[model samples]
Target: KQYPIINFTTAGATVQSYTNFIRAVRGRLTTGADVRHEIPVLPNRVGLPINQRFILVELSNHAELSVTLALDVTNAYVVGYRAGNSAYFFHPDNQEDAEAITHLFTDVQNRYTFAFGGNYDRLEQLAGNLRENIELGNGPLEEAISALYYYSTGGTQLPTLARSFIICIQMISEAARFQYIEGEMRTRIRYNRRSAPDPSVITLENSWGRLSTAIQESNQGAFASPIQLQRRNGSKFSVYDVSILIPIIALMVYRCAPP
Candidate 1:
């Protein structure tokens, strides 16, 4: 179903999961907080740690200047901004510290907008392709994780490495999110843990249900209101949702279930 001037987006190893987060923010399932550029404590080249990074978000008159003024005089500053939920950046030409982050967001925004939604059927195919990608698509995710790990480990230069913290988190989040999606598709397609291996992927299964069931059986005040399996309309965690926030699940299930 290729259009005359069409270029097909590859499904095998794309960042569809990261784009899913952006789409959720776009749809208001969550705030697009990542676009806001959260600053974190980081060690500089002299190997001194900048303390109170998150604590340093100043709320004062001319607050934007507060950010600019906070920069050490000799140090170049990187400014990140967004056109809607998408991210872009500005920095001194003498230093390219912002380069990797700028590229990450811009690249994500581009693939999300172009490769995904457009013609209805095309978009449908894209999602289906992504579904398959996650189910058996370890190749792309492995490469992506390796790159992220490289950045997190200071292989990409310490300056850029520190700034990459969020991106690294996003990478892991996307991978886990995709793995969850694959689980959902298989669970629905096969119905439960005892069912056949949904064919394409090996050993597709959902242990959450069995774990929940055990929690319910293990009564006592320790396990108050264990998760009951149910279908839903507004389920943020249903298969309909792209990425289930892992932290939220931890709060919901782990805290409630018997540890």
Candidate 2:
């Protein structure tokens, strides 16, 4: 799924001018990067400063515009070349709310109720992993930014986005393992079709306690980021590349791999 990234460069006056709609805001967060620009609103809109109204809308219009082009491309279009280092100190509006994985990846089961759910522990696990990646390997993530910027401007095949997604999931799982989640929160997976990824081709198997043990390297992980195995050479396939490399990247991203 695509997140709407709004960098309040100009005092938001430009966006708020369209206000009869309450259209653009996902949420007015409490804190952001140190710097902030006050977006100007209408003449007499008597409400809290946008900085105060924690709103949630769909992706912002411009953000949607940015990625719409890539989504339509069928023939190997470039994917993640992030552009210039705009200081978006703010976190996503949905940070407080657990993003539903099922929503992002749709259901593809043939005969049964697909088994997928979210856990607060898993969500915290996800947040901690992302936080660590951002905090510890701030260098690599920045390099990723540089790569994204170069790729965005120069145009390159994205060998990273798909891989990065896998890396993220593993990082979260590993963090959970290391810390050892206790209580009911840790052993649950809640059904959330919107944010939770759906099972596409694999059969959802139930394995007693192994379900907990294998969440990280399980089919659950791959199914979360499904790779359509395509035969390329005589004995090689595409998913092989993804399956093998993604874990390596995941380890590095999570600091599980040695420097």
Candidate 3:
């Protein structure tokens, strides 16, 4: 009987590192399985910040398992698995399989840190809230969160960073319309502009406008002035600005959270 194929994907190391890691995994596997690995070659002109490696394990029983590990600057986790004709994700029903795979991963990488602890539960709760907001049609909130996640990971390159910043500023502009209603703060609120905008909103709008221009014109120097940051004697906007802006946006989102 053939079992389902397991496809595991992880991020946080270079292609070469992933190759070495998979080699280590190959050495430790005692399942008497045949395993092979492959890393695709990239073109000279095509440079990407993120890289990944694929490992395929073929067991004696004709079952196959694959692992795709990505380059540095992100967390690693299993993506999903596939049966004969159906696909599945991480679920309670597969707890045993999940634990087995996790053990294999941990055993191969003994230096790995499993620091879920208290903050893990908090993160789950936060994810629940974000899901609720998305279900309620808060697209901007979701976009901003996705941008933040991308920025916090390996999306620090100029093009990717610019895209993330643009998304974040646009999301903030949309988020400014959010308001407290019936003692509960709401996102994606809509209202007519019959009165002067709030001071904070005005400032955010101005920043958004300038940032948009900077990205369009590719004016690196203009970013520093709009973001109000002096990067090493008024240098252009860099990752530092992104790091600072993330916390501020996070706080703004927190303030707008429903009570």
Model 3: ten consecutive residues of lowest lDDT: 250-259
- Which window of ten consecutive residues has the lowest lDDT sum in model 2? 68-77
Judged by whole-model lDDT over C-alpha atoms, candidate 2 comes out at: 0.22
Please provide, for model 1 over 21-92, each residue's C-alpha lDDT reduced to its tens digit, 9 standing for 90 to 100. Answer: 323322221111122111111112232222211110111111111110011101112233222233323332
lDDT per model, in order? Answer: 0.26, 0.22, 0.26
Name the runs in model 1 displaced over 4 angstroms: 1-124, 127-138, 142-171, 174-248, 251-259
Residue ranges of candidate 2 with Cα displaced over 4 Å: 1-138, 148-151, 154-156, 166-210, 213-259
| Predicted structure 2: clash tally | 23
Q: After superposition, how far is residue 50 of candidate 3 from its true place, in Å?
A: 29
Model 3 error, position 173 (Å): 6.0
- Residues 1-259, model 3: lDDT tens digits: 1222222122222234323433343322212221221111111212211122212221111122222221111111222222222222233234433343332222231222212211222333434432122221123323333433343334433333233223222222223211111001122223211122233443433344343333223332223333442232334443223333422221111011112
After aligning candidate 2 to the native by TM-score, how far in Å is the CA of 168 from where it should be?
4.1
Candidate 2, 132-236: lDDT as tens digits: 222212122222333333444445334442222222222222221211211111222121111221121011111111222222333423423333322212232
Please give the lDDT score for candidate 3. Answer: 0.26
